[PDB]
Amino acid sequence: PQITLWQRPLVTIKIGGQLKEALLDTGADDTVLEEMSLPGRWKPKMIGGIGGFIKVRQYDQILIEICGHKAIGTVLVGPTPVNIIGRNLLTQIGCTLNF
Amino acid sequence: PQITLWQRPLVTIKIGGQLKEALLDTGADDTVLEEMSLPGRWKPKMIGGIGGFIKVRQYDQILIEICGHKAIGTVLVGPTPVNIIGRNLLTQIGCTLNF
Numbered sequence A, B: 001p002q003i004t005l006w007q008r009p010l011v012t013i014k015i016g017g018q019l020k021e022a023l024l025d026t027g028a029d030d031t032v033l034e035e036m037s038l039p040g041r042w043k044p045k046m047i048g049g050i051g052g053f054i055k056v057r058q059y060d061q062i063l064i065e066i067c068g069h070k071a072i073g074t075v076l077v078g079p080t081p082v083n084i085i086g087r088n089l090l091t092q093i094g095c096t097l098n099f
């Protein structure tokens, strides 16, 4: 589909059997979601944006569905103000910027 | 043009007669540039990102060219990690997300 930017590009995602709302974020290197449980091993990571850095848990090879499009990648979990779908997963669903 | 996201979507912008590198950021509601000089008066604005909120200076009706496309709008100036082109200007150049 084509998503305009008149409003925040929020979409429905399916992860860990749960339905959530997330932001298609081209300014984000990684994907980070609010506190939730995920399977497998994880390691700590610090990510930074405007305001500074926050500590998150890094889980790899996680299955995620964005608007019905399946993709697998690293998903970060921590105190993020909003769910963010970053470039690491946006590439997988073939998302591009156009103008 | 069409921009993929395998690498950060960095483009050249022109403001105040100078070229700068900036990130097309769909996750950003506003445009915020690293410390620089802009004309006119400014107003205070608090913007929140991953690490919390920061105080920035808000200048309005500023001429800024993005990838050759001319825009005129609000530009914030403050301690940002990188120059960020947000949705307020991405809408002016007709940018959309597609997949």
Ligand SMILES: COC(=O)N[C@H](C(=O)NN(Cc1ccc(Br)cc1)C(=O)CC[C@@](O)(Cc1ccccc1)C(=O)N[C@H]1c2ccccc2C[C@H]1O)C(C)(C)C
Binding pocket: A023, A025, A027, A028, A029, A030, A031, A032, A047, A048, A049, A050, A081, A082, A084, A086, B023, B025, B026, B027, B028, B029, B030, B031, B032, B047, B048, B049, B050, B081, B082, B084, B086
């Ligand atoms: C490794 O560095 C990253 O890529 N870090 C990401 C990040 O923070 N990216 N930042 C900016 C940034 C920092 C460093 C670099 Br090299 C590039 C880019 C954003 O602007 C987008 C997030 C976001 O859209 C998230 C968000 C938080 C709260 C509500 C909505 C969305 C952001 O902080 N957006 C805000 C913003 C940025 C600039 C101007 C105005 C605003 C208001 C929000 O939209 C992340 C992995 C931690 C998510």
